[PDB]
Design a protein around this ligand. Structure first.
Ligand SMILES: *[C@@H]1O[C@H](CO)[C@@H](O)[C@H](O)[C@H]1NC(C)=O
Ligand SMILES: [Cl-]
Length: 197
């Protein structure tokens, strides 16, 4: 019984109120029961270079499937979760400092360790001269482990602080998962409820 529960942020494609989606593509499935994302949003989240933001995850070419999987999951979470209300902020809305559990950022970091990027902060500095985003002059492509030394850096500096690397572990009751198994239920509802109150 609070205004911050079961709402979608005022962003480009977000549905105005959450509601079930019978069909969401692969990495978006966990949110089928109640989603801020449309079917086409879940499709575009899986395209080689998504039009959701025209941000290429392949700006350094060497992006391994398990790394891209985490990023698609993060897009789904951002676009679909009806449980981000407590973190919705004026940018015309976004989220800021959603607390992601330790394991989410740790697994994300490990699975991207060997992929390549050219920037430690993905907000700004990109060269969009010919459409897509390219690495600027000086920014050499090195492993993720170089530009993102810790899991916290990857979680926080990839989405301009939309995400906060929580010290809390999964099943703490205090932090959200960017992805979860569809069959075991949504672990983020109760956490959102606690932040709303
Ligand atoms: C760039 O992406 C935006 C998505 O915000 C879209 O409106 C636009 O059509 C895209 N333009 C391209 C890829 O030239
Ligand atoms: Cl959620």
């Amino acid at each position: 019984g609070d205004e911050l529960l079961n709402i979608c942020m005022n962003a480009k494609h977000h549905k105005r109120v959450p509601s079930p989606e019978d069909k969401l593509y692969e990495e978006c499935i966990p949110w089928k029961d109640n989603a801020c994302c449309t079917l086409t949003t879940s499709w575009e989240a899986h395209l080689d270079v998504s039009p959701l933001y025209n941000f290429s995850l392949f700006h350094c070419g060497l992006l391994m499937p398990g790394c891209r999987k985490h990023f698609i999951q993060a897009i789904c979470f951002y676009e679909c979760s009806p449980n981000l209300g407590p973190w919705i902020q004026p940018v015309g809305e976004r989220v800021v400092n959603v607390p992601l559990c330790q394991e989410d950022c740790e697994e994300w970091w490990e699975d991207c360790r060997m992929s390549y990027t050219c920037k430690s902060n993905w907000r700004g500095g990109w060269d969009w001269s010919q459409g897509k985003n390219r690495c600027p002059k000086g920014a050499q492509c090195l492993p993720f482990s170089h530009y993102f030394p810790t899991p916290a850096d990857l979680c926080e500096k990839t989405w301009s602080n939309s995400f906060k690397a929580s010290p809390e572990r999964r099943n703490s009751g205090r932090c959200l998962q960017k992805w979860f198994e569809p069959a075991q239920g949504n672990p983020n509802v109760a956490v959102a409820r606690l932040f709303a109150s």
